Amino acid sequence: DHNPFISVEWLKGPILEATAGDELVKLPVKLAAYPPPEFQWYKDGKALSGRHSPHALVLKEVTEASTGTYTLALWNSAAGLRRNISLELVVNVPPQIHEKEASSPSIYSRHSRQALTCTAYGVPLPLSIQWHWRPWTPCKMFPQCRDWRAVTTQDAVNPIESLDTWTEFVEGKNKTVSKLVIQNANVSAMYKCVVSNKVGQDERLIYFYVTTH
Amino acid sequence: DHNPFISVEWLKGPILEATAGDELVKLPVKLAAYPPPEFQWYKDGKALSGRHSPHALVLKEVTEASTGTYTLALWNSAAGLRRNISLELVVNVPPQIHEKEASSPSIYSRHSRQALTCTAYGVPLPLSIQWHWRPWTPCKMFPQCRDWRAVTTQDAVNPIESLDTWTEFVEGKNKTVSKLVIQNANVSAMYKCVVSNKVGQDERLIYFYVTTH
Numbered sequence: 377d378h379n380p381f382i383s384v385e386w387l388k389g390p391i392l393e394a395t396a397g398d399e400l401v402k403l404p405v406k407l408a409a410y411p412p413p414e415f416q417w418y419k420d421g422k423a424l425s426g427r428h429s430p431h432a433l434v435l436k437e438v439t440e441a442s443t444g445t446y447t448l449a450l451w452n453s454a455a456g457l458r459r460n461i462s463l464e465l466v467v468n469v470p471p472q473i474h475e476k477e478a479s480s481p482s483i484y485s486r487h488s489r490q491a492l493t494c495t496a497y498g499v500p501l502p503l504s505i506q507w508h509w510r511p512w513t514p515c516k517m518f519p520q521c522r523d524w525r526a527v528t529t530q531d532a533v534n535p536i537e538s539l540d541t542w543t544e545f546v547e548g549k550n551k552t553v554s555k556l557v558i559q560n561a562n563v564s565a566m567y568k569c570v571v572s573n574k575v576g577q578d579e580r581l582i583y584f585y586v587t588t589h
Numbered sequence: 590d591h592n593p594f595i596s597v598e599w600l601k602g603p604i605l606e607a608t609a610g611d612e613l614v615k616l617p618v619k620l621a622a623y624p625p626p627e628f629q630w631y632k633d634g635k636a637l638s639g640r641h642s643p644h645a646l647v648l649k650e651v652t653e654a655s656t657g658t659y660t661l662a663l664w665n666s667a668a669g670l671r672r673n674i675s676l677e678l679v680v681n682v683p684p685q686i687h688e689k690e691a692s693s694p695s696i697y698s699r700h701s702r703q704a705l706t707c708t709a710y711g712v713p714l715p716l717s718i719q720w721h722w723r724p725w726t727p728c729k730m731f732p733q734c735r736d737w738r739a740v741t742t743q744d745a746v747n748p749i750e751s752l753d754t755w756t757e758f759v760e761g762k763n764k765t766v767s768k769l770v771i772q773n774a775n776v777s778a779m780y781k782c783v784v785s786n787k788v789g790q791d792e793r794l795i796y797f798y799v800t801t802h
């Protein structure tokens with residue numbers, strides 16, 4: 377009937393996921409309109425600079441800061457037509473264990489009590505941290521060894537005083553924290569804490585070298 | 590005499606410094622040539638994409654990965670002229686104390702021995718870490734309090750067993766590590782470690798809360 381229109385919808389939407397570090401991430405819409413409408417992309421309320429397409433907003437490289445609400449505004453003034461569509465960007469982050477970045481003791485005093493701590497952040501937040509152990513022996517089958525055993529009360533290489541996992545607020549972020557407390561440092565061993573979400577995994581190796589003073 | 594030439598030199602050079610996070614960093618040269626020469630920018634041997642000026646290469650945003658050797662190659666084939674000039678980019682990094690990112694004990698057992706550790710990386714690497722202390726009292730004069738005292742053997746709030754600083758290889762980086770060992774956790778106090786280079790400073794606060802069990 378020759379009448380102007382603006383139709384816009386998600387390809388699937390309203391939520392789109394990308395992993396931190398992904399380049400050229402498209403935020404697309406299904407847009408059919410006549411005549412070609414005026415438009416403007418926004419993020420969390422504020423306009424966006426540069427030449428864009430009304431069919432897809434392209435993010436050069438996503439970080440955790442790229443997370444937010446992206447809005448396409450379309451209008452045909454002469455026709456009195458207006459359409460707003462919003463896309464929720466979720467940027468997932470592969471988990472990191474922070475103690476890895478910090479110095480760690482090379483020697484542990486025999487018979488002593490020792491606490492081993494792993495702090496992990498990621499998006500989504502990993503809700504558990506798994507502890508594993510292996511003997512103080514070389515590896516035959518090699519980041520991998522084949523003799524790693526889960527840490528339990530049954531057949532522990534060193535007696536376990538405790539093993540707790542919780543959520544803690546650290547540097548403006550909610551973080552998962554696990555602490556394995558060894559009641560007595562009897563024998564050298566290797567421990568590791570492993571953490572995972574849907575977009576990645578991380579491991580911290582602890583060389584639990586034990587000597588007498 | 591109408592003869593073609595290519596002359597290129599550093600504005601000051603050969604070394605240019607920028608801080609990690611700086612945007613639109615110019616790597617400029619003093620270039621006088623006739624006729625307009627052909628040219629190509631490289632980084633550490635590999636060519637660079639995009640439209641550039643032979644007068645200055647513009648880096649959109651610098652990171653520690655932006656560090657390297659940037660080379661302008663100029664040539665006038667018909668004249669048989671060739672000129673290569675290299676600029677050394679150094680990207681400084683404000684220091685970070687990694688233990689800040691990780692969980693930290695809220696309570697310390699009275700009379701016990703406790704080690705406090707700060708691990709710092711930065712560009713340039715900070716060569717020292719300063720330890721300070723203040724009483725377990727509220728602050729009148731407030732990230733700042735006015736009663737912080739340097740940590741020494743004279744008038745220590747808790748007896749100091751040791752205080753060592755060294756360099757350690759951690760996660761593929763050389764890092765400065767300082768460990769303050771408190772011989773006896775007699776009294777609650779606040780400690781902090783402070784670290785600095787020419788482009789920044791960082792602090793980690795430790796709430797040394799002491800109780801009897």
Ligand SMILES: *[C@@H]1O[C@H](CO)[C@@H](O)[C@H](O)[C@H]1NC(C)=O
Binds near residue numbers: 421447458459460
């Ligand atoms: C579309 O978004 C803009 C910017 O937030 C807002 O001012 C306007 O009211 C919206 N228009 C419609 C059609 O909802």
Ligand SMILES: *[C@@H]1O[C@H](CO)[C@@H](O)[C@H](O)[C@H]1NC(C)=O
Binds near residue numbers: 548549550
């Ligand atoms: C962390 O967890 C608390 C408790 O559930 C929650 O209320 C808060 O929104 C979270 N904080 C952040 C910054 O994610």
Ligand SMILES: *[C@@H]1O[C@H](CO)[C@@H](O)[C@H](O)[C@H]1NC(C)=O
Binds near residue numbers: 631634660662
């Ligand atoms: C300039 O740099 C290029 C690329 O590294 C190299 O192949 C060429 O030999 C250099 N030319 C001159 C004039 O040194």
Ligand SMILES: *[C@@H]1O[C@H](CO)[C@@H](O)[C@H](O)[C@H]1NC(C)=O
Binds near residue numbers: 761762763
């Ligand atoms: C760290 O320090 C060592 C000892 O001086 C030095 O040889 C090495 O180049 C440094 N390593 C790195 C990766 O900076």
